[PDB]
Amino acid sequence: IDHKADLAVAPLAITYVREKVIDFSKPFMTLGISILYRKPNGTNPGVFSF
Amino acid sequence: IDHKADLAVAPLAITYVREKVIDFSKPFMTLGISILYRKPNGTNPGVFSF
Numbered sequence A, B: 001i002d003h004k005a006d007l008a009v010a011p012l013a014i015t016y017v018r019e020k021v022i023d024f025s026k027p028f029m030t031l032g033i034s035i036l037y038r039k040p041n042g043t044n045p046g047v048f049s050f
Helices: A016-021 B016-021
Strands: none
16 A cells, blocks of 8 residues: 555465455465374274174 | 457457557466366276176
């Protein structure tokens, strides 16, 4: 806003409110949400591992 | 290019060249290159298998 600076390249989600007050170029790479998980391990319950 | 239209709400892919000629809004949906393939007929069809 204050023109103390210019285009600010950094992690910057071009959201609804931001374009109201700033102008943003078209995104160079898309995003989204996924789940993070620890992949399973060979510790079979073995109550019945038959 | 000659404004015979003003808008085009179409599945049109933005390219380097066409943007040099035309102006585009932010992409409303994205896409890519996946692979078509038939799942392998479910479980293998083996019979009379003594």
